[PDB]
Amino acid sequence: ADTRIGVTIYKYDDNFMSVVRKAIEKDGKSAPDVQLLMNDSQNDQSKQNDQIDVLLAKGVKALAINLVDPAAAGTVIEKARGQNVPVVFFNKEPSRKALDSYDKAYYVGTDSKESGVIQGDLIAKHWQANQGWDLNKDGKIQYVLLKGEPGHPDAEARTTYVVKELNDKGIQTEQLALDTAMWDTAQAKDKMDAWLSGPNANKIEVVIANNDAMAMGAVEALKAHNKSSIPVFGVDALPEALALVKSGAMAGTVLNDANNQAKATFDLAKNLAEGKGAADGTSWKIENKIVRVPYVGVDKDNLSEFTQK
Ligand SMILES: OC[C@H]1O[C@@H](O)[C@H](O)[C@@H](O)[C@H]1O
Ligand SMILES: [Ca+2]
Numbered sequence: 001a002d003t004r005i006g007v008t009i010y011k012y013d014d015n016f017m018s019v020v021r022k023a024i025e026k027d028g029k030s031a032p033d034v035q036l037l038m039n040d041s042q043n044d045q046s047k048q049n050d051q052i053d054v055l056l057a058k059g060v061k062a063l064a065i066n067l068v069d070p071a072a073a074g075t076v077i078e079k080a081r082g083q084n085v086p087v088v089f090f091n092k093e094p095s096r097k098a099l100d101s102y103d104k105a106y107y108v109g110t111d112s113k114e115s116g117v118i119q120g121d122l123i124a125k126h127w128q129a130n131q132g133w134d135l136n137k138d139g140k141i142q143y144v145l146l147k148g149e150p151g152h153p154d155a156e157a158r159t160t161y162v163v164k165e166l167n168d169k170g171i172q173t174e175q176l177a178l179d180t181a182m183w184d185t186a187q188a189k190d191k192m193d194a195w196l197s198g199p200n201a202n203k204i205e206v207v208i209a210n211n212d213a214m215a216m217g218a219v220e221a222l223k224a225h226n227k228s229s230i231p232v233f234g235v236d237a238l239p240e241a242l243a244l245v246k247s248g249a250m251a252g253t254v255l256n257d258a259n260n261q262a263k264a265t266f267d268l269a270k271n272l273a274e275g276k277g278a279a280d281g282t283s284w285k286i287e288n289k290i291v292r293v294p295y296v297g298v299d300k301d302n303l304s305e306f307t308q309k
Helices: 015-028 045-057 070-082 098-099 112-129 151-169 185-195 212-224 239-247 258-273
Strands: 003-009 034-040 062-065 085-088 103-110 141-146 173-182 205-211 253-255 290-291 296-298
Touching: 003 015, 003 045, 003 258, 015 034, 015 098, 015 212, 015 258, 034 045, 045 062, 045 070, 062 070, 062 258, 070 085, 070 098, 070 103, 070 205, 085 258, 098 103, 103 258, 112 205, 112 253, 112 296, 141 151, 141 185, 141 212, 151 173, 173 185, 185 212, 205 212, 239 253
Parallel strands: 003 034, 003 062, 062 085, 085 103, 103 290, 141 173, 141 205
Antiparallel strands: 253 296
């Protein structure tokens, strides 16, 4: 009756993980037999490690961990193994060797590559439809790219495959600049402001961001320079970003399904806390201890299936 599940969020003010945290809390408030103990790791893996020791001292029956550093998976598994507590890692994917090292380690996330291919197809679709976006009329997309954290599975796959997909759809590309803005709105605004103040400013035709928070910072820098006709694409379909696709400030985004990843994390951690099989009594499909929830492309044409038009 007191099933205790310990949850760490790598940083509470990351925009997307804020949507995921609130949905896990909602699922916990809804289940009368579960108590969730939620922690903000404040983007520090040492802080997270200490929080996991306190959760284990408090007797949690399962841990649902969103890692600060994907490479710390082994440290967390060794803490959990000692007390035979199952661990459901979510959103930052650990290595396969770390997942295989413990039979009660699972992961809930997405297939990262798919969000890069869907973003590439959304760009391809809108580029073909808007020939005026080709400012210098050379048939090539001149773009800048705002990357998430270096080494994060989603940042690396989204950066690689958005361009690979455009080239496979037959659209040649020329990267004018690329830099990391660490998934953050303010850092992205500053980097875009710098590019709009440098020698390439007039040549930028498309802004590609690995997530919506960075797309939103770019939209702010573009408005400040009265360059709001430059299309911006993101990933996550945050409610604030959906507002920008409606107003045309953004051209498209990709739904990163926070509700189902939160639901799957909660369902697997509750089952495992109860000594049942991870997917018992659910529809989740676990393959090799991983659940991957699909990404969905979002633009003005299917916007009504995600928000009110
Ligand atoms: O690890 C946290 C990151 O996860 C990504 O999947 C998401 O697109 C980013 O916005 C950020 O939340
Ligand atoms: Ca061009």
